[PDB]
Amino acid sequence: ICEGGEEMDNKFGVEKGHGGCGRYQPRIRRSGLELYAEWK
Amino acid sequence: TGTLETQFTCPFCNHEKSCDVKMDRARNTGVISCTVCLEEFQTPITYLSEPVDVYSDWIDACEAANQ
Amino acid sequence: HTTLRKVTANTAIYYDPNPQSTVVAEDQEWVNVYYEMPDFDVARISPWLLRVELDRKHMTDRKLTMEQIAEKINAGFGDDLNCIFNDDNAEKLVLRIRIMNSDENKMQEEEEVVDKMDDDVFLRCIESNMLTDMTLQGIEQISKVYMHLPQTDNKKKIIITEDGEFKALQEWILETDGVSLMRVLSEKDVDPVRTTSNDIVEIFTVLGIEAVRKALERELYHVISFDGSYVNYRHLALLCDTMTCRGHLMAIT
Amino acid sequence: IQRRLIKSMESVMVKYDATVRNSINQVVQLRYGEDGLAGESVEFQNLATLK
Amino acid sequence: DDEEETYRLWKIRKTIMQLCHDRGYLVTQDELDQTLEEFKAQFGDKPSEGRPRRTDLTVLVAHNDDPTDQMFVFFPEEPKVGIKTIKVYCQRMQEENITRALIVVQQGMTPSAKQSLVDMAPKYILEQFLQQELLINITEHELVPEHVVMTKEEVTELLARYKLRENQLPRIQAGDPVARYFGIKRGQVVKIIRPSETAGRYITYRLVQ
Amino acid sequence: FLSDFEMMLQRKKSMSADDVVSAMIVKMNEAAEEDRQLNNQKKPALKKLTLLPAVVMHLKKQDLKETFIDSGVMSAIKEWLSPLPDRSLPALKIREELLKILQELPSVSQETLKHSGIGRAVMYLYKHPKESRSNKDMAGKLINEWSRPIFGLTSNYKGMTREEREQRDLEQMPQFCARARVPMPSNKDYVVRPKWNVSRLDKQMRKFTDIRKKSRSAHAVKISIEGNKMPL
């Protein structure tokens, strides 16, 4: 997971989190010359 | 000659490699489910039984039922 | 390394439901002694019997006794596998192994006891397990051990006499097939100063990079000097220094 | 085997510091051969004061 | 078996006393040459369910040139050492403000404990040895030459005489059996005095990294 | 008092917004209005394009997409996608990133599209002649994606239930050699769905495996033999 997705990094004038997007990462696999992404 | 198949085309929705086999060696039963249309079939297996045998039992039940 | 297989002559699995009238006539005379004073709950003895008879040649050749083998069997398995044995002075060296049952298996009056295997097939498994995996004597990974009175002086002990003469001493040295340098080195009566593996990877794991440099230079000198030819010590020392410069065994690959 | 050896030691040499370093200038030996002498000039001898 | 277990406990203690003496802790000749009979007489003879319980063997010893620098040797009774055990030793150390400890584990110790040992590393330096490794003092072996940890004042000199960046010396890894025996940590330098069949003697150095 | 062990453990353990979203939307409106003023002055409209990175980096936060949509992000995006006073299109980067974001912002309800006018703002770019072909494809697919729900259609094939397919399949039903010959798979159209056709040893083996492990001549620190996986 791209941690820290729960927080707005820029305060827009209003210890530090990772500031990620919160998205679950794919596991990438190779098939000869083609790359495939797989989400569990 | 070559390596045995482990993913199959759903005999109903024909979506390729959409069906996978779960083998419950404990209850002696194999379960196949289409990850697309969710169709399922279950058949009694033995220790010799491989995924290709389950898929075949599914095909034999379909071929017998579609008459 | 001496496994139960190494000393075993024959094994047999019998349906012997009552040891007090055992199907094996040779054993009735001595089996009574263990049931006359049972060290185990006789209600738990399985009717299937695994009788193992040991080869006296292979037993005395390595100073083994029935009591030691029974100790090893009881330790490796436990309360669940009772072992009975003949006296070492009898004509035939025999062990009588039986599976001990369990009260937890009695409590399931109607549940499907699928986790329990048939005793006769279980004994055949325990035999195939115990024969090749039951270490009775020795160290694993050591296939065989030769005994030798060194001839090369570098294998003989050399110790200075009070008057200064070097006076090599010939001492029994064991030359193994397979290695386990740390265990062999810690055995009592094994000289820990000189015992060596002739296997540089072992040297790195057991004695470290500098020890590796020394051991590698000696083994390389050994192969290069086998046919009697000579190479100046500079070339060996340089090769071993580069292979150990970075603190690890840098392969020439 | 000979290729492997040369490719592994081709850069090791004696520097003017009389230390033996390599391409990375890592000191391998503080003196060549632990004594700093060339292989052509040394000879076999017997140590009388030994033994 | 009590006779074999007493032999092993005596042999590890003998190796630990030699390790402490070589690391420069203060150990008396009587502790250093103690025989097995004299061990049985002091710590007892029945370790299975009896007198030399491993908590009874702990050594506390003081650096020969600074009596405030002290090292515990702990012999856990637990076959496999866990975080909770290390916590006990860390507390007993903090109470005594002893910064060094050596854990002679019987089986291995848990990856979590192996971590906590390095996690405490800046304030409390505690390190581990399998008892299987202490049955032999590896420095006694004929292959192993004499390692000497160099003090920093003299490594400055070493690097200045040879006009040599510390990165250029031969290396030794801290996990090395003798980097472990002498207890050295990276960036520290080991001097090495080796016999030589062409020079008679050869001194070399190894940076711990 | 705390032990140094607990201080260390606690220290390491210590390692493990709607207002700021609203303020972001406010800043997006301020940026688009300032770009309108700058465009009237015939100056380069840099404010939107200067804020774009900060905005895109936040609209991607999965945990906030609901907050973003419900806070009026669609209205602000409509303002940024809308042409300027001289009826020029926004910076290429703005169209590229906002169209891509909209594809990644699927929770948008019909009332949200109708009220914000984002649909009009994308159909505009889809028709517009100065729009690049890739942006026209993105706008085209967006328009299809957003209009399908209006007509109840859907494009997720994994979204149709099992019974729906079984029923549809019934709705669509009609009225020598010297060597072994490889047979070929059945082409038959399967309509009907078939009824289903429906330890004491491992404890001692684990004990022996443990005895084997216990016998090993292990070391406390795994020495790297050839320099592989060297630490630090």
Ligand SMILES: [Zn+2]
């Ligand atoms: Zn991310």
